[PDB]
Amino acid sequence: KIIHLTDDSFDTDVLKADGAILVDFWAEWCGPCKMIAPILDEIADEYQGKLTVAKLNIDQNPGTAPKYGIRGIPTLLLFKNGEVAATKVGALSKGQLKEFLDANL
Amino acid sequence: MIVSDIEANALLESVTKFHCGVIYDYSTAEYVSYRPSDFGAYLDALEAEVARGGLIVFHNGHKYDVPALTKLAKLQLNREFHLPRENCIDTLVLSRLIHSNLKDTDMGLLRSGKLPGALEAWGYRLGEMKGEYKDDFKRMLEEQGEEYVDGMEWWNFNEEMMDYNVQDVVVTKALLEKLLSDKHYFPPEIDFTDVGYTTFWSESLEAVDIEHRAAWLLAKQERNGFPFDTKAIEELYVELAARRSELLRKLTETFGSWYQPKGGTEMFCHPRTGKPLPKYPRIKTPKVGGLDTREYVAGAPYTPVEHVVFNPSSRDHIQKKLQEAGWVPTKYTDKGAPVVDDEVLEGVRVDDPEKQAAIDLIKEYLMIQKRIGQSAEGDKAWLRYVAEDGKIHGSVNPNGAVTGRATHAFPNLAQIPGVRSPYGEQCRAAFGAEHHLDGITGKPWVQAGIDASGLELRCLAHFMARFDNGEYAHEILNGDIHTKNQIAAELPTRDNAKTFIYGFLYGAGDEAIGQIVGAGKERGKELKKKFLENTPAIAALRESIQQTLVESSQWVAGEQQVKWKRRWIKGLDGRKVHVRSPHAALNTLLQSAGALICKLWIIKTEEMLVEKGLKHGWDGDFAYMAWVHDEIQVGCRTEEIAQVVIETAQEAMRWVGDHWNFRCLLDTEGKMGPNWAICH
DNA sequence: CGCTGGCACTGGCCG
DNA sequence: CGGCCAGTGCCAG
Ligand SMILES: Nc1ncnc2c1ncn2[C@H]1CC[C@@H](COP(=O)(O)OP(=O)(O)OP(=O)(O)O)O1
Ligand SMILES: [Mg+2]
Ligand SMILES: [Mg+2]
């Protein structure tokens, strides 16, 4: 249920998609990123109706993150109509994310 | 004999005022101070000592005190003052000869902490005078509410300055006596603090005389400076900076940027067991946060990172991109980091063609920064050292190497790129007599470059003549030896034929040899045999050295423990030449011999010119611009004079060879032209 | 075991 | 962010 982005697919898969898109900028070497991955898998099944969870691996796609000021990871950018609507950084708990989402959708 | 020291308002280049001076007369055993108003009297005292055929001792007076007094004498009193070289003694020159196994701060110009080994105590205290006086100033100062500025401790005289001056003389005296107590350089029968100048030079070891003359002449060279074409180098900088910008553009398109961990302030811990995981990037836990527009929560840890652009100058980055491209290092370093140099870079192979080609851009990029660094951006760059007279006055330590060789710095005019290398002609042409216009006529001067032919091989010949009855010496004088060695080793260029032998003759490993001449360890072995076999006397000479220095040694771990019979060798002039390692013993012998030969040579050369009536100086007929081990570059007022210098250089060399009874004829090769590019 | 040297640039550490 | 310093690698003879 999760989208896997690339530098070239980013524009049309995110900035030109309809509705909300939850982007996760992560990396294989980060402990916090490894912790949050599990959560995101479930957040995908559940919000299958009003949300799209998409991930971008900053090592394999070095061009996108810079344009956003990535300073820490995992970074969760919430896009709506090709525009960053919200954003939070760190390994949120399954119980904290759902809130962040609910309170923004 | 008197010991003296002076305090002035600035370095030689711009000194303009005499502050104070102190003199200790061994004859009266008393100390005498001289304040600003006593400048004429201080100078008289010195000339009085000269009128008696006496000696004046300074610590580093050959480069500063003596020439500073001449300048200050003309500016402040309209007096002509010129201490004769034969009346001056320099404890720094002496200290450097008798403790040549030790480093020194070059009178505070270097920081003692970055120097290896120990330092002679008295000399240390002397080289730290200024800084210690400065620290006292800022202190005495701030304890007054004032503010410290630039280097105001030198603008005016003061009793604190007077005391240090006195202290320097008392320490210089102590330093003198400890040096005079070394029976190897000064025979114990004579009390050297109580004899005329002629006795001091004639009864002491010949090295004491050679070091003071060389020092006196090289201080003159430093004062002459080297005519430098600033405009040519500024325009060279522009070319290179442009070429640098383009290679970066290309490379940064090929190798993109990436993120790295930075600012992690907490050990990462497994959520289930609590087990610490050091290998993971450090994290950071927010505290606070949880609409709340802020972008943080509370117990939600993250990993702080930074964006980093590919930097061709960083060996780390290079090593990281090429491995990702498919490279697997085979050569690593002590610390386990892979080796990234031109040698391995030239042999790295990858699939992506663009990446493979990028490698050349990387090698060209590094070489260009090497040029920009030396000529423009580095701390000791040429463009930063060019004086107002259009000349660069590089510093020279006449006896800075263990072997007796000199050392050069600020900047090192002895490491300028050769004409047969990337951008060498431009660098080389920028230094030259043509860039000096005559004070009267305004016409350019001319250069005379003289270099000693096959120097160290002739030194080898000399030392092995007692084993081969003069054979090697005979073959040497049968055409260029380096060219006869080139074809023999089936080598490409003559410079490379030189690198070979000198690597061969001083114990370079088979691999090292093969690399230079650049096949495998098999090549660098057949070549070691071919030449070592074509001359077995080199084997005899090596054994003697060993049997003369070493008694036996171990190999306990990564180091070396040796039992010596004597850890030094006697130089061509009788001084002690410290032998750091048994394997380098031969090198010490030949390099030391060559050095001492070139030192007497330049000394005898200038002495013969001044004898032919020529005047040394830009206001004369010729001027020493540089001395690079076995090469000298001299500026001449007319083509006619450059012809004489050259001719004369050859006469002096043959003289030196006779002086020390060398078993191999010595020769020189001179070139006349407008700059260093054409004169080497 | 090349050896003598100077020196530049990167990257970790700290006031 | 500039000073201290180790680790590296190049320039000359
Ligand atoms: N790679 C080296 N290793 C050790 N010593 C060297 C090396 N290259 C040169 N030397 C020594 C040899 C004597 C001194 C000056 O050498 P220089 O470069 O003038 O060559 P050379 O004097 O042997 O012959 P030439 O007549 O070609 O100048 O430095
Ligand atoms: Mg002094
Ligand atoms: Mg030579």
Ligand SMILES: [Mg+2]
């Ligand atoms: Mg030379």
